[PDB]
Structure formats: structure tokens, C-alpha cells
Design a protein around this ligand. Structure first.
Ligand SMILES: CCCCCCCCCCCCCCCCCC(=O)OC[C@H](COP(=O)(O)OCCN)OC(=O)CCCCCCCCCCCCCCCCC
Ligand code: SF4
Ligand code: SF4
Ligand code: SF4
Lengths: 176, 156, 70, 139, 90, 296, 212, 168
């Protein structure tokens, strides 16, 4: 089925040609466009004041790159390197010593916020849900030094909130 | 120290004047250009701040690099940057521009625009949220609040 | 709506109102309360000129009316 | 006819109405949901459209800062950050906390370009451990 | 001397504003040509036409009517000549 | 006191231009969908004052040509509200409409000099085409001005503001007035009809815009002139000029720019017979209605 | 700026002789980077080669892999994929119209329809969470299904958007000056449209009936 | 600030004609000729002066130097001879001003009474219709032949211009 456009000519009836000539010589449909944009003048504007009203989001937004931990416990990461194995921009750098008490751990867990493309493949891939995208998007960094995160930056970033990520993981242990 | 009090209020006045208007030029190659033209949309006005889009590089205030800067692009980039007036401030938007990012390991990608122009405000994201870019412009304006140019010229 | 645009329009409407009102204020102030004459032609110039001659004060607005009769 | 005159008194006085509009932007006050630490206030309307449901109003001098002017993003505690983006339709007065002893109550806000901001360093101990030459000198 | 003083004040304030604006840092087309000469000739015919309302009170109304229509008709005929002779194509 | 007349004439027009910038940005936002500027300053007035300050601060030919273009543009912007009869005009020129035309031509000079001193061939050919489409409408403006004052006798324009007490002159020549208003859109160099100090150049542009708005409002309509109380006439005149300036915004924010050859083709082969036929009708007709106006 | 391209035109003036569109300015090495990566780890390269068709490129890559791999995806996956394909088609056509307008002049319809485009970005936010680059279409059916409280919101959007596009045709679309700007230009012979490799909307415009 | 403003403006007029008679770059020439036409219009508008100089101010300074600058910009684009001739022309100006001032009469081949002269001038006579404006308000009652041949030469100028610039 094809419903095509413009197979029609302006018919040569005298009223048709004088109405089209009145459109020409009297600018009528132009003034109709003026009336359209004035109808949008008198509307109420659809803006939001930013620094007092932040914009809406989802529970499934992808944010901040924090490390979590157990409920009053140890670091939920294990250094199992999956997040580097699926990180497409390869911004994850992991080096893993085992600690003193026999359990396996890290030395160095680094993200390049310059390099990260914010997919959450590490979110879909961390087998214990340690590294989780956060809610917020406010870095605005003055330096190119600060945008290379280390393990203590990520753990302090996880210290800056849990109850947010608690509500998000409670909203997303069902779909993902 | 009535001269120093006049210097303080006059520096306040010109720093308020610099941070107030800030009409940029959008450099804008790839999808971060679409995100800039989405933070000029009705749901996020730059025009609440007086920040007005303008394609005139002889009156630009902040140059926003946004998109995948390439080797074939870069001489045109710094030729744009040279004929900009000496009050100039640089916002690197997007993971392409603030460190190369996703196309980092290839030929013909300058690994971030640090190698071309000096950068004032890095803002990350691929794409960044429009709302986050507006926040980055706010923290740039707080940098313009912190200039003390006239104090340094007074006691240089 | 327009609820935040009538301040700028009102202030700019005062700023366009001011030169005409100030000019009329000064035209009345600088003639002793009269209106400034407008001699487009040499005839009204001559009439205005004999008017400022017969005032005596070199100032035509006084116009010395019906007092130098007798 | 009515809203533009019962708003100054509806704000509490011309001290605050000058303060709220000359502060930055808006005068849509009136719904009084809550307030939280470092003084900040939180309002939710049920009259306007979406995205103008909810708003923070910040306060001054919250970390030695004198922030009457130049308000930041993330001056907010995180439970109201859940509330404010409309990730839920419910205020964080239902169940804010968690009984875990690692969360800041201070909320050290945006800090780039201060005397206090993050710097990178490799969190690893010694690499190759050179052979130290001995103490007692031969000959 | 009224309008000479006003003219001079406009010049001096404009120069003051320029000096504040300055001191504080411290092959062709043939179709272009026919537009100018077309303007020049029609502007000359404008220069003939425009003192008509000063003239519009005579006792020989028929002569003024006829020569006025002659002037505008010749202006439209010159337009018609370049119109038929494709004088402004692009 | 006459110097006070001069200063009250030529100083508040700059505040008028700056507040026109805020008004056109605000109303074009409320057309489009935008509050703003409403953040810097209460409802955005400190924002244009800071605009002008910041543009004065910045640190950017043939300094002869480089200075003589904006000095001429802005002295035109200053000199060109001399005879506009806000009831008592500053100089009672016995002929002022020809002065309007002459100073439009001087603005053409200013744009050509800045284009020559620009000294780059793409900007040169751009400024050349802009000179041609600036000069291409002073024909139509002149001839329509001729026909509208032929209905009113004399060049004096004070006789005109006398004669528009009875009817608004928009009625007895409406298509002629409409074509003059489209030519004002062309002469102001705005949409649809289309390097420094841009403050001066910009300033002269907008002062020419408000001049054409006020000259439109005086040439075509007005209010009844109260004896010994011109304040009411000034109020209704100013409100009409402002409503026409908002209408000028309203036409701005809704149409694309023409193609340049479409602009010229439209001017010659669409205005130029129609203006001529309406003007010869206003020549031949007041002699037919027993009505020739009294040049005094 | 008048995308970003080098244009080298040669002309008799206000006119033409011939031009060379030089592109390569935005070259990124995408094929080489995919030559060193895997399938899943390079699906975002297809998501952002084109950036407007944020789901249609996903659908094309996923059907390439599913066509190679002998997998018939389940029906609800197919319907969700078709729904997002038509939505992204809507967003792509509305960008094409609005950037054609902002190129031509014509300020205000750009901002009307970018309000619309912000709403549809909000639907992508609720579905994946990403603003624009919702990769989200894994090869082998769509991962992480759409949450509860979405379809009636799409229904509400559908009604209001049919009104807004009627209003957009009111604004543009048989305007005197937009017709006066662009009717005379760009004719394409349909036989030459086939042989010059024109595809898509070009075959729609010039004659011959075709739609995949 | 004194009486002889006609003589003063005429000195600026001679300055302008010398300033582009020294053959500069032609856009410097156009600038000087604009200044010359402006002060000539000022002179004639000082001899009363109602209309006719302002009439031609549109044409000579509104419709001529525009076309000169136009055809100079689309055609083509310091030296001792130009500056030397300008200084010597200024010197002849200075010498003629001196012989007007501190003598009685100046003769090139005439006799010119050397003093600033409002004389001769009208004795305040009743015009009431602005004599030169009604003079220009002729050509349309008595001017049969003159506007006929003038418009005819305009039409012939039109066809001549287009033919020479490649009719058709
Ligand atoms: C440099 C000079 C620039 C002059 C610009 C043009 C001025 C102009 O158009 O003046 C016209 C006006 C004619 O006088 P008007 O009021 O029309 O009445 C007729 C009898 N005065 O002229 C006047 O009112 C005065 C004429 C000029 C006097 C000053 C000359 C300065 C040179
Ligand atoms: S996938 Fe998770 S547990 Fe494994 S190394 Fe990465 S963060 Fe640690
Ligand atoms: S979100 Fe993507 S780019 Fe960022 S660390 Fe995770 S997998 Fe890597
Ligand atoms: S950073 Fe990401 S969104 Fe921005 S231009 Fe690069 S690929 Fe596009």
C-alpha cells in the first residue's frame, strides 16, 4: 500500500484562483503562521529552574562508579577481573595481591573517567554487584589529574551514599 | 586602604560582568553536539543565564570542545582558537574530548584536547547529561567568581 | 506567561517616554509658560522678530499686550 | 488578581520575598514538606506540572562557606537526592537510614579546586627491592 | 547653531564611546554591477519625481497630471524594458 | 537648558537600546519556549547592563577606516531622532523626510566602509551583497513616503501629525503602508531579509530599528493632540511604538531567511510595479476628489 | 560553522561550477577497533557510528548476528524491538526536519520539537537509563525488559504528539516562503537515483516504489 | 564662534577638494569627496537653503559615492608625490587666506572684496512660500519640454547601460 503525496493541481475555478491570488496578494496564510506562534506565546513555558529543581531521572540511570561493600563488612569486590574483561574502553586496571589474613584481595582498582563510556557492562558483569553505577552526575573537574580514580576514591565515593544504591538495587534485583 | 577597598569592589564588578553573560561558540562535532543543542532546549535554558549560542568566533567567550577531535581536525581547531579574544575559557565536554575515551587506541584521535588547547573545565559523560553540562557551566562561573585579576595587577 | 516580561517592557516604556516629556517640560519652562514659536517661513520670522523687538527685553514671550496703547 | 498580592504575606514578609526572589529565581512557595541537615528546605507542590513538583531551597554557611550566593549541586544529603529526581514519589521521611557504620553524616560536597580535593596515586607497595650495598667498608 | 551644536555633541559622544571602546585594552560578477546602475537611474527618476507635492497646487492641473503620468510611465517603461530584456537574471 | 535637551535626547536612547535587547530576548523566548534571562539580576536587567560592560572590557582595517566605520554608524544612530515629532520635535525642520532618506544612505556608506576595511574576500563579497540589498529598498521606501505625504501636503511632518487626527492614515492607504513596512524590515537588516567593535555596530543597528518603528508610528497613525497637555499623546504614541516593536519581534521569530536572488527578484518584479501603480493612483486621485492638501 | 565537513566549492559567482565535499574530518577508526574487539564489547561502536538511530543500528547489528547464528528471537522481544525502532525512526525524522529548519533559518519549530525529543529521551531514561546511547539490544533478544508503568505513558505521548505534529505542519508545510525557498532545487532522475546508489528517502521522493 | 562661518566652511570645502585631488587610493578619495559634498550642502543650506542642497544630498551623497565605492570594491585595490602635492595645495590655501585677511582685495583674474560677507542678502522680505521650494515646485506646470527631454535621456541612458554591459 502506497499513500503518496502531491498528485493534485490547483483547479482553474474562478473562486479557486481568486482565493489563491488572495493568499498571494494579501499574505493570509503567513498571518495564520503568526497566529500559531502567538498561540504558543500565551502558553505557560515548559522550563525547569535547574539549581533548585534538578531534572527527573529513572531508578535505572547510570552514574557515578562507586564501589560498595557488605552490610557492615569487607569490600564486596574480590578482584576477579571481569570488569576489565568486559570493560570496552578498558578503563579498569586491576592488580590483586592477597592480603595478610589469607583471603584474596586487591592492590589497585582504577577507572579512567576520561575513558569510561558508561555502559554498565561492569554493572551487568560484576558477579557480586560490587561496582555499581550511582545516581548523580556532578564531577565538573578542573584538573585532568583528578579524573583518574583510585580505590580509596571509589570507596569514599561508596561511603558518600549507600541508601541511594540500596533503593536502586532493591529496585533492580528483579529485572537485572 | 580606600584604594584597596575600591579595588575589591571593582574586581567584584568586572568578575560579575565576566561570569554574567558568557556567550559561547559551539564547536560540536559528534553526538555531544546534539547534547549541547539539547541543553539549549526548552527544558534546560542557557538563556536563563544570559548564555546565548553564537557562531561568531570573534566574540566567543567559552570554547566548548565536544566530540571526537581528530588529527585531520586539529589544525583547524587551533586556528579557530587563535583568533579568539584573549579572555578565553575552555570547556572540554565528553569522554571523546577530555582524554580520548572510547576511540583512544586508534590512529587519528588526539588523546583528548589537552594536546591542542589548555582546558579549564573537564565535564565527563558519553554523552553527558545536559543537566550535568549546565552544572559544569555553573562551576566554571564559580571559577570566574574566583579570579582576583585586579588584585594581582594592583600588587604585581 | 508574560508575568516576568512586563518589568522590562515597563522600564523601557518609561525610557522611551522620557525625552518627549522632558522636551515639553523644557519648552514650557524656557518660554515663561508659553509654547516655542515655529517660523517655517520668513513671514512668521519677521512677525516674531518685530514681536521680540517691541517687548523691549529682547524676549518675545512677554508680548506687552494692550498696555503700550496710550 | 489574587495570587500576586497574597504571596508576600504568604511568604511571611517582604524580608523573605526580597530574599527568595533576589536569591536566585522563584516565588512558588507554600507546601512545606521538610527540611534537613545543613539547614536546607524541601518543598513539593501538587499543582504545577511534572519536574516542577519538587525543589530544594539551600541555606547559607554550611561548611564554612558563606553560600547565600553561588549555590552548588550536591549540597544535598543523599536521601533527598533520591527524593528530588523523582526516582520515587515518596519523601525520605519513610525510611531514610541504614544501620551500617560506614556512611558519612558530613557530606563533603563538590570540592574541586580547593585546598582539599582528590589526587591520584598508585596504591601498591614496593616493586623490585634493590640490593642494598653493605655497611662495613672493605679495606 | 542649535543643530550644529547637536551634531557636534553626537560626534563628540560617539568619539568618547569609541575611545573608551578602544583604549581600555591598550574576480567579480557582472550581475552585481547592473544592480548599482539600475538603482542609480531609478534614483535619478526618484529625484525628478519627489518635489511633486510641492507642485500639486497649480492652475494648470491638466498639464501637471499629464507630465506626472509621463514621468511614472517612463519609469515603469524602463523597468518593462529591462524586464523583457532579462535585465536582472541570476 | 538646550544642552539638557540634547543630553535627554541622545543619552536615554542607549538605555532604550539595551532594554530593547532584553525585551527582544525575553519575548522571543516566550514565543519559542523559554524563560530567561531571569537568573543574573531580578528579571534580567542587570544582565544586559553586564552584557555591555563585559563587551567593553574585552581585549581584541587601516585605523582610519577601522575607526571611521563605527563612528559614522553611531553618529547616524544619534543624529537620526532629530525631527520626529514626539509632540515637540527637537528641531522643527521644514523638511525632514528627505533627511530620513539621506541618513539611510549614510548607513549604506558605513556598512561599505567596514566591509572594505574587513580585508578578506569572502567578507568582502558578503558585505558587497549586503550593500546591494540595503540599497535595493530605498527606492520603494522613497516612493511610498512620497505618496503618503502627497495626501498630506508638506515635508514638514508636523502638518502630518496635525492631519492624522481625523483618521489613522493606515486606512486610506493600507497596501502602500504594508509595503513600506516590509521595506522597513528590509532596511533594518533582520530576518527574513539578510569584525568590531560589535557593541557600536550592534548599537547603531538597533537604534536604526527603533527609529523606523517610531517613524512608522508617526507616519501612519497616532492619537489626538491635547492642547497644553502633550503627556497623554506621548503615552499613547509610545505604547503604539512598543506594540509595533513587539509585532516586529513577532514577525522575526517565525520566518526563514530568503535566498538572496529570491529577495531581489521579489523586490523588482513584485514591489516595483505595484508601488508604481499605487503611487500613480495617489497622484491622479486627490485631484479627482476635489482634495489637494494645503502646503501652507 | 554555516554536521561538520570541508566543502570546497568552485563557482561562477552566486552560482556554481563544481564542488568537492571533503570528509574524513570525523574519522575514528571504528572498523579497526572492531577488528580487535569481540561482539558484545563492540556493539556500542555500532550504537554510535550513527548517533541518531540509537536503536536502529542496534537492531541491524543484532539481526546480523542472529542471522549468522541461527536464532529466532522470542515474540515479546520482537515487539519491543519494533516499538523502539519506530520511536527512534520518529526521533530521526524529527531531527532531520528540525535541523533542516535551523539550517534554513526558521528558529522556533526546532525548539517545539526538541521539547518532544526531550520527552522521548526521558522514555529511554526509564527503559535503559542512558540519556542517548541506550545500547540495550543484546544480540539474541533485548536484555532487561521494560518496567511496570510505561505503556500507558507511551499512549499519552502518542495522543499529545499527534496534536503537536499537526501543529508543526500548520507552522511549516505550504508556507509561501518555505515553498519559495525549496521547491525548484534538487531534482533527481529515478533511473539515476538507482544507479547513483541513492537509497532510502531519495527512492521515496523520486518515483520508484521501494521499502524494505 | 564668529560671523564668517560661510568663509570658514568654504575653507573646509577647498580642503576636501585638495584632499582628494592629490590622487590617493580611490576609497580615500571617496571619503574626501563625501566630506566635500557634506560641507557644500552645509554652505548652500546656510545661504537659505531650505531645500535644494538637501535634495541633492540624497542624490550626490546618497546615490553616487555608494556606486563609486561599489564599483571600486569589485574592481581592484605613503608615497611622496601624493603627500607633497597635498602639502603644497594646503600651502596655496594658506597663502590665499593670508591675502584675503591682511589685504583689501584679491585678484586671480577678477576683483574680490577681501572681507567676510553676509552681503548681499535679503532684507527680511515677506516670502511666505519659501521661494526656492516653489521654484522647484515649477517644472510641472511650466516645465513641458524640459522634463520630456530629461526623462527621454534617462530612458536612453538605461538602454545604453545595458547594451554596453552586454545587451542581452
Ligand atoms: C555638517 C553639516 C550637516 C548638516 C546635515 C543636514 C542638515 C539639514 O538637513 O538641515 C535642513 C535645515 C533646513 O531648515 P528648515 O528647518 O528645513 O527650514 C527652512 C529654513 N530654515 O537646515 C537648518 O535648519 C540649518 C541649516 C544648516 C546650518 C548649520 C550648518 C553647519 C555646517
Ligand atoms: S567484576 Fe566485581 S568482584 Fe570482579 S574484579 Fe570487577 S569489581 Fe571486583
Ligand atoms: S561502565 Fe562501561 S566503560 Fe565504564 S567501567 Fe563499566 S564497562 Fe567499563
Ligand atoms: S563522548 Fe560519547 S556521546 Fe560524546 S561525541 Fe564522543 S561518542 Fe558521542
Amino acid at each position: 500500500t502506497y499513500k503518496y503525496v502531491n498528485l493534485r493541481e490547483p483547479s482553474m475555478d474562478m473562486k479557486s484562483v481568486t482565493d489563491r491570488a488572495a493568499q498571494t496578494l494579501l499574505w493570509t496564510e503567513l498571518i495564520r503562521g503568526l497566529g500559531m506562534t502567538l498561540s504558543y506565546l500565551f502558553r505557560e513555558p515548559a522550563t525547569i529552574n535547574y539549581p533548585f529543581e534538578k531534572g527527573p531521572l529513572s531508578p535505572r540511570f547510570r552514574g557515578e562508579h562507586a564501589l560498595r561493600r557488605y552490610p557492615s563488612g569487607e569490600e564486596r569486590c574480590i578482584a576477579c577481573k571481569l570488569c576489565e574483561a568486559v570493560c570496552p574502553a578498558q578503563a579498569i586496571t586491576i592488580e590483586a595481591e592477597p592480603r595478610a589474613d589469607g583471603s584474596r584481595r586487591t592492590t589497585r582498582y582504577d577507572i579512567d573517567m576520561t575513558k569510561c563510556i558508561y555502559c554498565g557492562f561492569c554493572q551487568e558483569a560484576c558477579p557480586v554487584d560490587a561496582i555499581v553505577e550511582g545516581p548523580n552526575f556532578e564531577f565538573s573537574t578542573e584538573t585532568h589529574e583528578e579524573l583518574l580514580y583510585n580505590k580509596e576514591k571509589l570507596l569514599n565515593n561508596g561511603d558518600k551514599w549507600e541508601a541511594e544504591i540500596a533503593a536502586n538495587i532493591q529496585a533492580d534485583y528483579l529485572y537485572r | 586602604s580606600r584604594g584597596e577597598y575600591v579595588v575589591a569592589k571593582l574586581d567584584d564588578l568586572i568578575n560579575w560582568a565576566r561570569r554574567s553573560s558568557l556567550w559561547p561558540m559551539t564547536f560540536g562535532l559528534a553526538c555531544c553536539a546534539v547534547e549541547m543543542m539539547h541543553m539549549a532546549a526548552p527544558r534546560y535554558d542557557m538563556d536563563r543565564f544570559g548564555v546565548v549560542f553564537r557562531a561568531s568566533p570573534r566574540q566567543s567567550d567559552v570554547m566548548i570542545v565536544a566530540g571526537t577531535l581528530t588529527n585531520k581536525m586539529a589544525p583547524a581547531l587551533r586556528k579557530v582558537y587563535d583568533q579568539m579574544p584573549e579572555p578565553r575559557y575552555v570547556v572540554s565536554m565528553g569522554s571523546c574530548a577530555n582524554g580520548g575515551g572510547y576511540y583512544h587506541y586508534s590512529y587519528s584521535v588526539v588523546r583528548g584536547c589537552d594536546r591542542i588547547v589548555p582546558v579549564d573545565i573537564y565535564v565527563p559523560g558519553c554523552p553527558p547529561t545536559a543537566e550535568a553540562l549546565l552544572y559544569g557551566i555553573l562551576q566554571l562561573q564559580k571559577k570566574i567568581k574566583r579570579e582576583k585579576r585586579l588584585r594581582i595587577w594592583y600588587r604585581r | 506567561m508574560w508575568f516576568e516580561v512586563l518589568p522590562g517592557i515597563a522600564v523601557m516604556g518609561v525610557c522611551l517616554f522620557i525625552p518627549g516629556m522632558a522636551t515639553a517640560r523644557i519648552h514650557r519652562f524656557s518660554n515663561g509658560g508659553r509654547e516655542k514659536r515655529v517660523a517655517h517661513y520668513s513671514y512668521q520670522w519677521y512677525l516674531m522678530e518685530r514681536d521680540r523687538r517691541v517687548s523691549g527685553v529682547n524676549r518675545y514671550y512677554v508680548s506687552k499686550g494692550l498696555e503700550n496703547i496710550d | 488578581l489574587k495570587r500576586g498580592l497574597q504571596q508576600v504575606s504568604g511568604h511571611g514578609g517582604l524580608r523573605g520575598y526580597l530574599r527568595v526572589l533576589f536569591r536566585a529565581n522563584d516565588v512558588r512557595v507554600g507546601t512545606l514538606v521538610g527540611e534537613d541537615k545543613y539547614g536546607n528546605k524541601y518543598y513539593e507542590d501538587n499543582k504545577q506540572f511534572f519536574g516542577r513538583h519538587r525543589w530544594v531551597i539551600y541555606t547559607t554557611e554550611m561548611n564554612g562557606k558563606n553560600t547565600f550566593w553561588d549555590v552548588d549541586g550536591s549540597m544535598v544529603p543523599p536521601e533527598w537526592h533520591r527524593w528530588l529526581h523523582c526516582m520515587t514519589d515518596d519523601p525520605p521521611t519513610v525510611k531514610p537510614p541504614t544501620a551500617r557504620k560506614f556512611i558519612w553524616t558530613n557530606h563533603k560536597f563538590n570540592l574541586s579546586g580547593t585546598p582539599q580535593q582528590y589526587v591520584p596515586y598508585s596504591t601498591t607497595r614496593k616493586k623490585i627491592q634493590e640490593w642494598v650495598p653493605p655497611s662495613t667498608p672493605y679495606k | 547653531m542649535n543643530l550644529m551644536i547637536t551634531l557636534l555633541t553626537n560626534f563628540t559622544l560617539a568619539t568618547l564611546l569609541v575611545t573608551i571602546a578602544f583604549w581600555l585594552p591598550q574576480p567579480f560578477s557582472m550581475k552585481f554591477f547592473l544592480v548599482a546602475i539600475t538603482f542609480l537611474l531609478f534614483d535619478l527618476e526618484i529625484a525628478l519625481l519627489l518635489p511633486l507635492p510641492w507642485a500639486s497646487q497649480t492652475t494648470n492641473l491638466n498639464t501637471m497630471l499629464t507630465m506626472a503620468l509621463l514621468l511614472i510611465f517612463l519609469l515603469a517603461v524602463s523597468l518593462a524594458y529591462e524586464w523583457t530584456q532579462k535585465g536582472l537574471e541570476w | 537648558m538646550f544642552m539638557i535637551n540634547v543630553l535627554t535626547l541622545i543619552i536615554p536612547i542607549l538605555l532604550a537600546v539595551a532594554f530593547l535587547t532584553l525585551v527582544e530576548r525575553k519575548v522571543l523566548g516566550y514565543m519559542q519556549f523559554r524563560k530567561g534571562p531571569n537568573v543574573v539580576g531580578p528579571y534580567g536587567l542587570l544582565q544586559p547592563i553586564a552584557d555591555a560592560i563585559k563587551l567593553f572590557i574585552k581585549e581584541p582595517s587601516s585605523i582610519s577606516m577601522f575607526i571611521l566605520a563605527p563612528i559614522l554608524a553611531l553618529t547616524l544612530a544619534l543624529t537620526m531622532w532629530i525631527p520626529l515629532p514626539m509632540p515637540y520635535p527637537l528641531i522643527n525642520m521644514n523638511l525632514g523626510v528627505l533627511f530620513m532618506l539621506a541618513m539611510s544612505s549614510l548607513a549604506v556608506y558605513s556598512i561599505l566602509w567596514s566591509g572594505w576595511a574587513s580585508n578578506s574576500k569572502y567578507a568582502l563579497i558578503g558585505a558587497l551583497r549586503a550593500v546591494a540589498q540595503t540599497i535595493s529598498y530605498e527606492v520603494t521606501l522613497a516612493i511610498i513616503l512620497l505618496s503618503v505625504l502627497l495626501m498630506n501636503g508638506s515635508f514638514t511632518l508636523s502638518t502630518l501629525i496635525i492631519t492624522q487626527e481625523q483618521v489613522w492614515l493606515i486606512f486610506p492607504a493600507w497596501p502602500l503602508a504594508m509595503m513600506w513596512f516590509i521595506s522597513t524590515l528590509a532596511e533594518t537588516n533582520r530576518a527574513p531579509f539578510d569584525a568590531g567593535p560589535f557593541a557600536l555596530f550592534f548599537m547603531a543597528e538597533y537604534a536604526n530599528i527603533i527609529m523606523m518603528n517610531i517613524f512608522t508610528t508617526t507616519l501612519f497613525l497616532g492619537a489626538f493632540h491635547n492642547p497644553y497637555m502633550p503627556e497623554l499623546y506621548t503615552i499613547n504614541f509610545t505604547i503604539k511604538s512598543l506594540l509595533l516593536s513587539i509585532t516586529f519581534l513577532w514577525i522575526r521569530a517565525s520566518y526563514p531567511r530568503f535566498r538572496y536572488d529570491q529577495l531581489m527578484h521579489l523586490l523588482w518584479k513584485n514591489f516595483l510595479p505595484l508601488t508604481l501603480a499605487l503611487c500613480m493612483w495617489h497622484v491622479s486621485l486627490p485631484i479627482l476628489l476635489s482634495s489637494i492638501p494645503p502646503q501652507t | 560553522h554555516p554536521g561538520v565537513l570541508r566543502l570546497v566549492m568552485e563557482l561562477s559567482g552566486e552560482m556554481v561550477r563544481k564542488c568537492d565535499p571533503h570528509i574524513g574530518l570525523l574519522h575514528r577508526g571504528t572498523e579497526k577497533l572492531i577488528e580487535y574487539k569481540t561482539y558484545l564489547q563492540a556493539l556500542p561502536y555500532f550504537d554510535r557510528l550513527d548517533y541518531v538511530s540509537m536503536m536502529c543500528n542496534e537492531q541491524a547489528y543484532s539481526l546480523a548476528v542472529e542471522k549468522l547464528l541461527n536464532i529466532q528471537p522470542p515474540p515479546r522481544a520482537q515487539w519491543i524491538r519494533v516499538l523502539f525502532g519506530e520511536i527512534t525512526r520518529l526521533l530521526n525524522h524529527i531531527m532531520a526536519v528540525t535541523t533542516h529548519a535551523l539550517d534554513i533559518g526558521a528558529m522556533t519549530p526546532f525548539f517545539w520539537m526538541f521539547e518532544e525529543r526531550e520527552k522521548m529521551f526521558e522514555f529511554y531514561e526509564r527503559v535503559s537509563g542512558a540519556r542517548m546511547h541506550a545500547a540495550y539490544v543484546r544480540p539474541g533478544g533485548v536484555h532487561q525488559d521494560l518496567p511496570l508503568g510505561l505503556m500507558d505513558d507511551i499512549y499519552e505521548f502518542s495522543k499529545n504528539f499527534s496534536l503537536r505534529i499537526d501543529e508543526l505542519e500548520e507552522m511549516l508545510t505550504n508556507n509561501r516562503i518555505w515553498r519559495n525557498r525549496t521547491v525548484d532545487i534538487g531534482v533527481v532522475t529515478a533511473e539515476d537515483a538507482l544507479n547513483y546508489g541513492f537509497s532510502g528517502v531519495m527512492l521515496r521522493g523520486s518515483g520508484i516504489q521501494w521499502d524494505l | 564662534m564668529m560671523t564668517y562661518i560661510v568663509f570658514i566652511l568654504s575653507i573646509i570645502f577647498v580642503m576636501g577638494f585638495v584632499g582628494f585631488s592629490s590622487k590617493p587610493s580611490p576609497i580615500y578619495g571617496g571619503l574626501g569627496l563625501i566630506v566635500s559634498g557634506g560641507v557644500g550642502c552645509g554652505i548652500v543650506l546656510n545661504f537659505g537653503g531650505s531645500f535644494l542642497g538637501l535634495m541633492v544630498f540624497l542624490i550626490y551623497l546618497g546615490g553616487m559615492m555608494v556606486v563609486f565605492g561599489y564599483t571600486t570594491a569589485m574592481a581592484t585595490e605613503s608615497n611622496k608625490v601624493v603627500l607633497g602635492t597635498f602639502i603644497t595645495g594646503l600651502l596655496m590655501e594658506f597663502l590665499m587666506v593670508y591675502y584675503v585677511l591682511k589685504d583689501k582685495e584679491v585678484e586671480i583674474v577678477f576683483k574680490f572684496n577681501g572681507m567676510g560677507d553676509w552681503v548681499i542678502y535679503d532684507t527680511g522680505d515677506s516670502g511666505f512660500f519659501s521661494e526656492e521650494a516653489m521654484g522647484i515646485a515649477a517644472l510641472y506646470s511650466y516645465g513641458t519640454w524640459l522634463v520630456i527631454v530629461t526623462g527621454w535621456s534617462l530612458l536612453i541612458g538605461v538602454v545604453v547601460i545595458m547594451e554596453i554591459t552586454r545587451g542581452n
